[PDB]
Scaffold this active site. Structure first.
Site, PDB file in Angstrom:
ATOM      1  CD  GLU A 196      53.846 107.709  42.314  1.00  0.00           C
ATOM      2  OE1 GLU A 196      54.533 106.879  42.991  1.00  0.00           O
ATOM      3  OE2 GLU A 196      52.716 108.140  42.653  1.00  0.00           O
TER       4      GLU A 196
ATOM      5  CD  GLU B 113      48.602 106.614  41.661  1.00  0.00           C
ATOM      6  OE1 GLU B 113      48.906 106.425  42.882  1.00  0.00           O
ATOM      7  OE2 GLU B 113      49.200 106.043  40.742  1.00  0.00           O
TER       8      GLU B 113
END
Length: 366
Positions: free
Chosen positions: A162, A286
């Site tokens: 991320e 995710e």
């Protein structure tokens, strides 16, 4: 078929390949666990694995999940603390050996495996930091590509997790020009570095995130996705609807209501419009909803989200951090010590929503 090598990687597009994926599970809070300060990695380079409280990963943990028809396993992996100085940034041999051991658990069982760079301290989406970050990226990804070059198409590399502007107002809102530029530059480095490594890597499937891997318009509209590489996949993380699935403060809810449903549809529509409608393969690497003692609401939600992303050809990968109790993020699904599915109604909802026969194996018995 007849004369084909056992080593050979299939030359197949990511759009076709992902039709082989049912749905997935992350080994979370394990190889990604980062305890540089608390532990002493120089004195034990693989102790980080169990430092957030998970047991040492075994092959039987994956076999339980395979029995339930999971067939993609993401192994989030934090390299920071396990590699040396400039200019080589050499990964410690014992840590690389263990990561290799863990990948082999799902791999040697014929499932898909994604390996990434996870809680890195050095790849933040900043300008004045980027030169170093590209240099490290290149060196680290070269080593990992070299280590696994002989692995077939079932082993996918996800270049960054991320990447974002840590601790600024734009960290989680989708970024700003500086962050977008940085994430694009880093992705292209990752991609170049693997495509030119030895063995099967030229034909390896590779995941790249937008900024923060965020499902949001800012990130999506500013993400650069490569031309004429048919083996690249967009990486997106989306715990929607956030208030039901992940929020631990004021707006949190424990009911999947008509507004959470609309919020999740909106998010699904953004992915559909940015990727599926643009002929770009994507995997939701995710997602998850925490346990708030609301199994029936979480079952309804999980079936709904699965049926929605299945209806569009997108696989998703549950985030399982091994955490079932407490206040904090209870994303546990597999009891890794007893080798049991703790929430069988969630696994049935994933099988069902995927279009599979429902058959939950190794359920806890309460």
């Amino acid at each position: 078929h007849h004369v084909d090598d056992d080593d050979k990687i299939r030359d197949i597009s990511s759009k076709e390949l992902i039709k082989e994926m049912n749905f997935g599970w992350n080994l979370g809070n394990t190889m990604d666990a980062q305890c540089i300060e608390y532990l002493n990695y120089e004195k034990d380079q693989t102790a980080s694995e169990t430092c957030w409280g998970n047991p040492k990963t075994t092959e039987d943990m994956f076999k339980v999940l395979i029995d339930n028809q999971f067939n993609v396993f993401r192994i989030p992996t934090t390299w920071s603390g396990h590699f040396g100085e400039a200019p080589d940034y050499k990964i410690d041999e014992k840590w690389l050996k263990r990561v290799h051991e863990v990948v082999d658990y799902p791999y040697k069982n014929g499932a898909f495996v994604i390996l990434n760079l996870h809680h890195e301290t050095w790849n933040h989406a900043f300008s004045e930091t980027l030169d170093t970050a590209k240099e490290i990226l290149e060196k680290i990804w070269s080593q990992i590509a070299e280590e696994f070059k002989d692995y077939d198409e079932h082993l996918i590399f996800e270049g960054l997790n991320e990447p974002r502007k840590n601790d600024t107002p734009v960290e989680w809102t989708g970024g700003d020009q500086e962050g977008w530029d940085a994430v694009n530059a880093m992705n292209a480095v990752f991609l170049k570095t693997v495509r030119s490594a030895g063995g099967n890597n030229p034909k390896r499937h590779l995941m790249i995130p937008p900024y923060a891997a965020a499902c949001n318009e800012n990130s999506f509209n500013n993400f650069i996705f490569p031309e004429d590489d048919d083996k690249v996949i967009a990486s997106v993380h989306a715990y929607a609807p956030y208030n039901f699935a992940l929020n631990n403060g004021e707006g949190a809810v424990d009911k999947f209501d008509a507004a959470g449903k609309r919020d999740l549809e909106w998010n699904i529509n953004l992915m559909k419009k940015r990727f599926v409608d643009q002929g770009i393969p994507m995997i939701l690497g995710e997602y998850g909803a925490m346990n708030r003692d609301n199994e029936e609401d979480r079952a309804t939600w999980a079936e709904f989200y699965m049926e929605k992303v299945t209806a569009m050809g997108v696989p998703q990968i549950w985030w399982d951090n091994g955490v079932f109790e407490g206040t904090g993020e209870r994303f546990g699904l597999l009891d890794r010590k007893n080798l049991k599915i703790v929430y069988p109604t969630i696994v049935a909802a994933l099988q069902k929503g995927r279009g599979l026969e429902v058959n939950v194996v190794h359920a806890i018995e309460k």
